[PDB]
Amino acid sequence: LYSLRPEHARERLQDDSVETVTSIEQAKVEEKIQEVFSSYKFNHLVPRLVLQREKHFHYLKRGLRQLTDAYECLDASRPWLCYWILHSLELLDEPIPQIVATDVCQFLELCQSPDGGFGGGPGQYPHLAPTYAAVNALCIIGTEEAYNVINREKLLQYLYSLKQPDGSFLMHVGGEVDVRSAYCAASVASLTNIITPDLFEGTAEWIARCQNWEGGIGGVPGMEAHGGYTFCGLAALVILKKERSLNLKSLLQWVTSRQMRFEGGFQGRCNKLVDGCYSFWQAGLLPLLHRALHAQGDPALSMSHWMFHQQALQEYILMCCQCPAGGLLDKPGKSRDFYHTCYCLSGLSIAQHFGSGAMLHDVVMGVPENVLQPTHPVYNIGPDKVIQATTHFLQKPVPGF
Amino acid sequence: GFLSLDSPTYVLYRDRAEWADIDPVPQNDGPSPVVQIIYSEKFRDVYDYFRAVLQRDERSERAFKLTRDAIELNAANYTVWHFRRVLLRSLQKDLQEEMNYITAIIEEQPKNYQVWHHRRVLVEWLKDPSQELEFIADILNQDAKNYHAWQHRQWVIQEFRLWDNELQYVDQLLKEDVRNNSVWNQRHFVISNTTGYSDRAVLEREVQYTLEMIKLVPHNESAWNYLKGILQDRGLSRYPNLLNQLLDLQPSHSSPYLIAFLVDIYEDMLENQCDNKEDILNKALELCEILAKEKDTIRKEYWRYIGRSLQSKHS
Ligand SMILES: C/C(=C\COP(=O)(O)OP(=O)(O)O)CC/C=C(\C)COCc1cccc(C(=O)c2ccccc2)c1
Numbered sequence A: 001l002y003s004l005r006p007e008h009a010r011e012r013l014q015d016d017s018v019e020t021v022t023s024i025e026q027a028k029v030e031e032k033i034q035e036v037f038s039s040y041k042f043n044h045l046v047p048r049l050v051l052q053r054e055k056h057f058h059y060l061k062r063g064l065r066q067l068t069d070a071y072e073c074l075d076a077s078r079p080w081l082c083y084w085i086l087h088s089l090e091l092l093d094e095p096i097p098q099i100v101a102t103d104v105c106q107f108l109e110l111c112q113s114p115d116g117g118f119g120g121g122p123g124q125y126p127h128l129a130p131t132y133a134a135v136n137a138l139c140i141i142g143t144e145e146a147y148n149v150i151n152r153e154k155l156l157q158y159l160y161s162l163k164q165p166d167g168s169f170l171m172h173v174g175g176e177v178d179v180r181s182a183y184c185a186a187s188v189a190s191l192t193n194i195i196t197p198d199l200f201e202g203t204a205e206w207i208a209r210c211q212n213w214e215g216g217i218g219g220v221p222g223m224e225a226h227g228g229y230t231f232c233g234l235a236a237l238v239i240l241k242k243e244r245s246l247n248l249k250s251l252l253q254w255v256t257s258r259q260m261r262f263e264g265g266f267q268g269r270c271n272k273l274v275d276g277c278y279s280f281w282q283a284g285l286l287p288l289l290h291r292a293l294h295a296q297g298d299p300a301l302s303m304s305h306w307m308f309h310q311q312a313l314q315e316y317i318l319m320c321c322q323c324p325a326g327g328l329l330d331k332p333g334k335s336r337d338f339y340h341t342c343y344c345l346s347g348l349s350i351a352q353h354f355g356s357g358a359m360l361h362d363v364v365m366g367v368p369e370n371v372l373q374p375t376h377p378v379y380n381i382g383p384d385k386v387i388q389a390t391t392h393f394l395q396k397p398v399p400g401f
Numbered sequence B: 001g002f003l004s005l006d007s008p009t010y011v012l013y014r015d016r017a018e019w020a021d022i023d024p025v026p027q028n029d030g031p032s033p034v035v036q037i038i039y040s041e042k043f044r045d046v047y048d049y050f051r052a053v054l055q056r057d058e059r060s061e062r063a064f065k066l067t068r069d070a071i072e073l074n075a076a077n078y079t080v081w082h083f084r085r086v087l088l089r090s091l092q093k094d095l096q097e098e099m100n101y102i103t104a105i106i107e108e109q110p111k112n113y114q115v116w117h118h119r120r121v122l123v124e125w126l127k128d129p130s131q132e133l134e135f136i137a138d139i140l141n142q143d144a145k146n147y148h149a150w151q152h153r154q155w156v157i158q159e160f161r162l163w164d165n166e167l168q169y170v171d172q173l174l175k176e177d178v179r180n181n182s183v184w185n186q187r188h189f190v191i192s193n194t195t196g197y198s199d200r201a202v203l204e205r206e207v208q209y210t211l212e213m214i215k216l217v218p219h220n221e222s223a224w225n226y227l228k229g230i231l232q233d234r235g236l237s238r239y240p241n242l243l244n245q246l247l248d249l250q251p252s253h254s255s256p257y258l259i260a261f262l263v264d265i266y267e268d269m270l271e272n273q274c275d276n277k278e279d280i281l282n283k284a285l286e287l288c289e290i291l292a293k294e295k296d297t298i299r300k301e302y303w304r305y306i307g308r309s310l311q312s313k314h315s
């Protein structure tokens, strides 16, 4: 274990004897993480990195049917809960009973708006986030019933209703704009084959304006570079085949600088705290950058590894992010939730599976039963589901109106 | 008459007479619900009634007051926020009282998107930005890195052209925490939208300031990234003295940020036809190995790539 090596203690924060809220909070985290790393030594047991599959599974299969009122704050994000859970099960190789699947299809049907797109629950106005989630869920299920749920003409019409003159998209009508809306749109339109010629006109340019002095991408032009927005911006560009619109080098330098030398996991933005969900938004960028630089025929690219420390990340997630009762989380001391379970699991899979053409190199830390199903770095659903969905919807032509 | 959702004497809407006429529309989750939330009686109650007034599109003062309860139960429900803005215009509500409302709920839930978007819509309607910089500063006094707060600040400053005092504010927060990257970002936002970095005097002022900050906190990554960010533009090799000046902190302020910044300067020298190319290249590769094997092993895959790529390029 890279984290447990003695030389690793040298990675602890050096505050230069100038304390600020930033150094003080980072220190608290490193202290907390250190107690976790060293627990084995203090209890004299041999470290056993084991992904608690059965624990995670009961938590997931349970949340997929019902949730306590703690989830009232997610009453407007129900298609998200379906996506996070169904996607987590998928990574855990847990299949969806034809009965559950149809129930989910029926539910998302209630969330779907008569004017295209999906709402966060039965009867809610459509919004791009739950639309992205609903569509991703339906593709994970991948049945003809699931695919048929999506009204492709109203969906395209809906995207057009959010399209802006500058290339951006509103998240919903009378709503806000940021890099997430472009990704939600590019994701659902590509998967469902509704991309017309002018739909994403000027979108690659608008997203490129979101890249700042840091190399990363902010929510809108001018904003601080963030891991969540940077994944959306780059993944959207890959879908649009415009990755080259970004300074890929400065971005590569920024994302790799986000891995915490000590904790091993990724932080969202410079000088903030590590968080397990970033195992996906940040680490997920490396596979994307790999593909892009290789598309530019980059000779120096690795033939076996992603450009981040895959070992340290897997160690952070396994030792520091699992809840004994099942479910994964932000960092030690945090409460488990379906969002973090989805992204900690998603980021683990990215850390375990490498691929670049004919090259396929796995790196599974701990018990080999730790290997999870691979995840497509752009859509974040199984690679097979993506091929299966696009191949299906390609049988339908792009809505002419 | 706002009966607080928290009030000890708060009563369900169904147990309320001024509501009695309207029948509550429950939620249709289907015969076989999934990710079904076991609502509390209160949550369930307010939403069945919200559903009812919305289904009938009842633009009443009573509907306006209920949305407030539905928002407090779930501030992320954008549909409710939507209807609420609908009612703000119909009933012709005092938008200043509504600014007071949104100021209060943002203080309570500053990390919510809806609350901030709503405030923006109000500022647009009233075309009044007078309270903004002060309100936002109070939120940043609680969480100096709130992304929404910084986004809102950027929008108010750009829309209403309130640039004059932001660089001073930035200096203030940098004194408070020189590691606050949101502030280093704000610094670049202000400068690039006012003077720009082509003005050599400004550039000089900024590169010197940043260098002092590095002296004080050599391991503060933000100062380093800002230094790279404003010079990287014109090409780090365009600045001869800089390589020297950093090679001096080599024993004093020599974190792996200094090491990395040197590989950055070398990278650019190689690309811009530098003298001693064979020499400079070995250095950059030496640093790349010191980094990959010793100083910055978390980024070994990156530093190796940098090594390879550098060779492939200037062999
Ligand atoms: C404010 C902020 C980060 C700042 O958070 P902070 O707590 O300060 O954390 P850090 O310190 O780690 O930055 C933005 C984080 C962005 C992320 C995680 C991008 O995630 C992808 C995505 C796609 C589509 C929708 C969403 C939504 O989250 C969503 C939610 C509601 C409505 C619609 C869509 C996200």
Ligand SMILES: [Zn+2]
Residues within 6 Å of the ligand: A275, A276, A277, A278, A330, A340
């Ligand atoms: Zn998180």
